[PDB]
Amino acid sequence: AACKCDDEGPDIRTAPLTGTVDLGSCNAGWEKCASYYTIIADCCRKKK
């Protein structure tokens, strides 16, 4: 699911709705763009 993000890897505050709703913590490659979102869910964008 598509999620609102603030920290798009290198180019941090550019493109808001980017991140995907991931569970807790992200694998290397998936850059924590909204590190925490809800309950036990976080939002990451792949490399960008």
Domain ranges of the chain: 1-48
| Type of residue numbered 12 | I
Sheet order of strands, 2-4 included? 2-4, 17-23, 41-46, 30-38
Q: How was this structure determined?
A: NMR
Q: Please measure the distance between the N-terminal and C-terminal CA atoms of the chain and give it in whole angstroms.
A: 17
CATH 3.90.1720.10 fits 1-48, yes or no: no
CA distance 3 to 1: 6
* Paired tokens of 1: 């699911």
Complete DSSP assignment for 1-48:
-EEE-S--TTS-SS-SEEEEEEESSPPTTEEEEEEEEETTEEEEEE--
Q: Beta partners for 34? A: 43
